[PDB]
Design an enzyme around this catalytic site. Structure first.
Site, PDB file in Angstrom:
ATOM      1  N   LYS A 174       0.987 -15.665   3.338  1.00 43.20           N
ATOM      2  CA  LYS A 174       1.320 -16.328   1.981  1.00 43.20           C
ATOM      3  C   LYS A 174       2.689 -16.813   2.055  1.00 43.20           C
ATOM      4  CE  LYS A 174       0.036 -18.490  -1.602  1.00 43.20           C
ATOM      5  NZ  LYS A 174      -1.000 -19.451  -1.956  1.00 43.20           N
ATOM      6  N   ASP A 208      -7.445  -6.176   4.120  1.00 39.35           N
ATOM      7  CA  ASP A 208      -8.303  -5.447   3.353  1.00 39.35           C
ATOM      8  C   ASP A 208      -9.495  -6.363   2.771  1.00 39.35           C
ATOM      9  OD1 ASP A 208      -9.481  -3.167   1.887  1.00 39.35           O
ATOM     10  OD2 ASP A 208      -8.717  -3.851   0.185  1.00 39.35           O
ATOM     11  N   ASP A 230      -5.291 -17.679   1.179  1.00 41.19           N
ATOM     12  CA  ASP A 230      -6.342 -18.264   0.313  1.00 41.19           C
ATOM     13  C   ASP A 230      -7.009 -19.361   1.147  1.00 41.19           C
ATOM     14  OD1 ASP A 230      -4.094 -20.030   0.695  1.00 41.19           O
ATOM     15  OD2 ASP A 230      -4.301 -20.760  -1.357  1.00 41.19           O
ATOM     16  N   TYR A 241       0.849  -1.268  -0.155  1.00 36.26           N
ATOM     17  CA  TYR A 241      -0.109  -0.084   0.026  1.00 36.26           C
ATOM     18  C   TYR A 241       0.766   1.268  -0.056  1.00 36.26           C
ATOM     19  CZ  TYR A 241      -4.885  -1.584   0.728  1.00 36.26           C
ATOM     20  OH  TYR A 241      -6.212  -1.829   0.781  1.00 36.26           O
ATOM     21  N   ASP A 243     -13.150  -7.418   4.437  1.00 39.43           N
ATOM     22  CA  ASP A 243     -14.528  -7.335   3.515  1.00 39.43           C
ATOM     23  C   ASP A 243     -15.301  -8.715   3.460  1.00 39.43           C
ATOM     24  OD1 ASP A 243     -14.358  -4.654   3.230  1.00 39.43           O
ATOM     25  OD2 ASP A 243     -14.971  -4.750   1.181  1.00 39.43           O
TER      26      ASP A 243
HETATM   27  C1  IPM Z   1     -10.994   2.905   0.102  1.00 32.56           C
HETATM   28  C2  IPM Z   1      -9.837   2.184   0.149  1.00 32.56           C
HETATM   29  C3  IPM Z   1      -8.469   3.229  -0.223  1.00 32.56           C
HETATM   30  C4  IPM Z   1      -9.626   1.609   1.505  1.00 32.56           C
HETATM   31  C5  IPM Z   1      -8.372   0.472   1.685  1.00 32.56           C
HETATM   32  O1  IPM Z   1      -7.970  -0.170   0.527  1.00 32.56           O
HETATM   33  O2  IPM Z   1      -7.782   0.320   2.672  1.00 32.56           O
HETATM   34  C6  IPM Z   1     -10.967   0.819   1.733  1.00 32.56           C
HETATM   35  O3  IPM Z   1     -11.197  -0.174   0.789  1.00 32.56           O
HETATM   36  C7  IPM Z   1     -10.820   0.241   3.263  1.00 32.56           C
HETATM   37  O4  IPM Z   1     -10.710  -0.754   3.509  1.00 32.56           O
HETATM   38  O5  IPM Z   1     -10.822   0.919   4.195  1.00 32.56           O
HETATM   39  C1  IPM Z   2       0.470 -23.828  -3.452  1.00 33.52           C
HETATM   40  C2  IPM Z   2       0.675 -22.434  -3.997  1.00 33.52           C
HETATM   41  C3  IPM Z   2       1.982 -22.029  -4.400  1.00 33.52           C
HETATM   42  C4  IPM Z   2      -0.410 -22.386  -5.157  1.00 33.52           C
HETATM   43  C5  IPM Z   2      -0.753 -20.901  -5.433  1.00 33.52           C
HETATM   44  O1  IPM Z   2      -0.595 -20.085  -4.635  1.00 33.52           O
HETATM   45  O2  IPM Z   2      -0.766 -20.400  -6.574  1.00 33.52           O
HETATM   46  C6  IPM Z   2      -1.709 -23.148  -4.834  1.00 33.52           C
HETATM   47  O3  IPM Z   2      -1.968 -22.474  -3.506  1.00 33.52           O
HETATM   48  C7  IPM Z   2      -2.843 -23.038  -5.614  1.00 33.52           C
HETATM   49  O4  IPM Z   2      -3.724 -22.293  -5.781  1.00 33.52           O
HETATM   50  O5  IPM Z   2      -2.494 -23.616  -6.795  1.00 33.52           O
HETATM   51 MG    MG Z   3      -4.126 -21.351  -3.724  1.00 36.34          MG
HETATM   52 MG    MG Z   4     -11.794  -2.386   1.919  1.00 34.24          MG
END
Ligand code: IPM
Ligand code: IPM
Ligand code: MG
Ligand code: MG
Lengths: 357, 357
Positions: A190, A246, A222, A140, A250
């Protein structure tokens, strides 16, 4: 005497802040806090008056304050503006300028609003999570960054970075938060792909030695995106970076169902900013429709984290519960055909539900 | 004559690829495809044998092949291994070595497996999403990267980066995929904070001019994390980067409910690799419990995308549906107190359900 800087912002920002200010002014009078509030422009309101999303005057106002309240920033009215001058840049500059590195976004469902949840009832029955997102570092704010033309080809780039000190401070916040909750912390990264996030895992593991009473767990971002949906009740405190926070915040917010009920705190050393996490919702701006309860609950967080008024932070949170118990609903949280009240009335309703002598 | 490089990998990989092999062989013989299959080592299996997750020999076998089949990579067994040698490096090096830039992950829910879904039945009932994730660029492969010490403090860094050609090629695959579907494409970025993703939005907007039949809309990554669970039926084809695609695809996989049913295809120019997206499930590894259906459906994707055997790709897909109608269930997709069959049997069931002679 405590100074509170106010930046209502764009869209429904002004009206939801007015409603929450009713409640704030009420607690101030009852408790005799002697707060001094000042208003400054931010986002699109600032562009409209100063052609800048966070004028120097607005910034010094915030710097001079003890607590900052922000309504909302954003809207298509300012798309014609250069990227560096967009409304959310002001929000990012406030966070960065005040060094508000600890973003706290609690996710729980009000028992009378459970039906708004997208997940099956039994899953989200008891979802109570606190996302502790790092707010002032990461990709960021990483340097270098930008757009460039290499051999006639456009190239965009951003730098993800974190040093051990940035990771350590946000970790302490999350670990201290876990101790005062259910003693469970899940650090999200990650680490098997992104080195930055592997250092994140290493430093959090070191700080974990300082909190023998909390159970630390690491999870890939993930996988964490699946667990939030598959078994949300497994989370207590969820720690992660700016970027991942972020996204996962959400996601956590949506599974509660009511975005207009969710508050947030952005804490730093001797400063703090409180804002709702629902956005400026331009399409209903000025229609007295917006739910101010998220902004009101953010004021309750301010009373707790900034004004040393826990008993009053609880009374504000109790009034919100009371308003719901008595069937009061704004458009976003009301069933079809069911009675609905506006932003103004909902504010005055919480003031009454405060049962002030 | 077509060459297929097979990399069973770790955990449940050897058993799920064997089941899938039952099906491939049954189709090859019936269709007279004349496929030449070779087996190689990847991940921890390769480490145990060569102390390298992707030996040069394995890379050349994959580079010589027309299609690659991979089971699963990873496990706590190789935690003692240095970061550069972890099992997942073999996977990343394959995607990158063969320049498999287009990752396709269809998120659909089977009619008889709807109860596994975590969302309210009315939402998920019609979920039909295809996540097209850029696989060879972004922060995943961005330089510079690493961990250093500056003034006695550890600093972790990674570089997010994309050029217009990288975006143009993945955009084309996504726009093309959308045409053959509901002609609706949603491009996910963070264009208001990350410049790399603003270029992404711009280039995608450019290529959109070539596909007048498909409706293009942009969305921020955080909002997409909300939108996926709030109203999943709004999505047809979702286009995004390596990192974002990584998180969002896993979220889309979870809402279908059964991860053991999900296939994937990583396409490049003249090359392609097919793997399930459930991981190596080390705990049940070698117990003949693993659901081989995701891999079987991945073989179905290979028949369609590499072997030019669409009708046979459909028959494999039709056989998997038949098996479910017959009430055949492996542990993961079996209701409590319901009959459960093993990996091998489930593979034979599909071959039998092919109704050959
Ligand atoms: C609007 C954006 C710049 C901000 C962020 O990315 O942090 C928002 O999405 C949040 O999570 O407060
Ligand atoms: C294991 C990892 C490196 C890989 C990725 O992050 O792409 C996996 O999580 C996927 O989604 O195939
Ligand atoms: Mg993955
Ligand atoms: Mg946000």
């Amino acid at each position: 005497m405590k100074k509170i800087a106010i930046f209502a912002g764009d869209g429904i920002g002004p009206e939801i802040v007015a409603a929450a200010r009713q409640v704030l002014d009420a607690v101030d009078q009852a408790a005799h806090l002697g707060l001094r509030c000042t208003e400054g422009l931010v986002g699109g309101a600032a562009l409209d008056a100063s052609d800048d999303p966070l004028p120097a005057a607005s910034l010094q106002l915030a710097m001079a304050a003890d607590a900052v309240i922000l309504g909302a920033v954003g809207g298509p009215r300012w798309d014609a503006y250069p990227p560096a001058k967009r409304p959310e840049q002001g929000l990012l500059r406030l966070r960065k300028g005040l060094d508000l590195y600890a973003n706290l976004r609690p996710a729980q469902i009000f028992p009378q609003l459970l039906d708004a949840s997208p997940l099956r009832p039994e899953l989200v029955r008891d979802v109570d999570i606190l996302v502790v997102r790092e707010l002032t570092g990461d990709i960021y704010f990483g340097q270098p960054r930008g757009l460039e033309v290499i051999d006639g080809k456009r190239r965009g780039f951003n730098t993800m970075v974190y040093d051990e000190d940035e990771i350590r401070r946000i970790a302490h916040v999350a670990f201290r938060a876990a101790q005062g909750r259910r003693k469970q912390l899940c650090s999200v990264d990650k680490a098997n792909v992104l080195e930055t996030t592997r250092l994140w895992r290493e430093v959090v593991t070191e700080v974990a030695r300082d909190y023998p009473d909390v159970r630390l767990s690491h999870m890939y971002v993930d996988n964490a995106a699946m667990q939030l949906i598959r078994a949300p009740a497994q989370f207590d405190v969820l720690l992660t970076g700016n970027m991942f926070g972020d996204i996962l915040s959400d996601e956590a917010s949506q599974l509660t169902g009511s975005i207009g009920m969710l508050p947030s705190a952005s804490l730093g050393e001797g400063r703090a900013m409180y804002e709702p996490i629902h956005g400026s919702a331009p399409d209903i701006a000025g229609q007295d429709k917006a739910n101010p309860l998220a902004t009101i609950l953010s004021v309750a967080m301010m009373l707790r984290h900034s004004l040393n008024a826990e008993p009053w932070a609880q009374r504000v949170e109790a009034a919100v519960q009371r308003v719901l118990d008595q069937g009061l609903r704004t458009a976003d949280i009301a069933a079809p055909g069911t009675p609905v009240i506006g932003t103004k009335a909902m504010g005055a309703a919480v003031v009454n539900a405060l049962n002030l002598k």
